[PDB]
Ligand binder design. Structure first.
Ligand SMILES: [Zn+2]
Lengths: 50, 49, 65
């Protein structure tokens, strides 16, 4: 698999932190999901993870 | 009445949610108010949950 | 369910040192150094605070409210 395609694919679902790639917050927490421990909406979880 | 939109921590959402022993109020009987000055009759640690 | 006020063996007041202990868990302190800083020399209070499970919030999650 070409490196450019993998890079373009990972740029849409991940962010660069200290040279490494961390998955985006909205990917782990969909809009209809909630915190399994507190039940807060997924938007707050995404803001906290960001 | 005034809290954040999320307020995940119970401290911001609710008030008096943890009943500490400091809420105990000594009620004088008869002349105990005159014999005992204010602040003497009270819980020892004042922080027991 | 909830942290007991008195220690079973000795009887030292331990209910008031629970939430602060949780603060020491919210901080970078480990278990042993936090129990030492709280003033628990004998191991009975250390067992009381360490082996205690906080089930009151799990029950309040099922409370009527
Ligand atoms: Zn003890």
């Amino acid at each position: 698999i070409d490196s450019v395609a993998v890079l373009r694919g990972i740029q849409k679902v991940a962010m660069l932190v200290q040279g490494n790639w961390v998955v985006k917050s909205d990917i782990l927490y969909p809009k209809d999901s909630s915190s399994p421990h507190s039940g807060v909406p997924a938007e707050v979880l995404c803001r906290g993870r960001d | 009445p005034h809290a954040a939109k999320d307020s995940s921590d119970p401290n911001e959402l609710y008030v008096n949610h943890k009943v500490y022993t400091r809420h105990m109020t000594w009620i004088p009987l008869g002349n105990q108010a005159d014999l005992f000055p204010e602040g003497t009759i009270r819980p020892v640690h004042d922080d027991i949950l | 369910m909830i942290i007991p006020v008195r220690c079973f063996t000795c009887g030292k007041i331990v209910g008031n040192k629970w939430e602060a202990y949780l603060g020491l868990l919210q901080a970078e302190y480990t278990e042993g150094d936090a129990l030492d800083a709280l003033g628990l020399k004998r191991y009975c209070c250390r067992r009381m605070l360490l082996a205690h499970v906080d089930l009151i919030e799990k029950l309040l999650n099922y409370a009527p409210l």
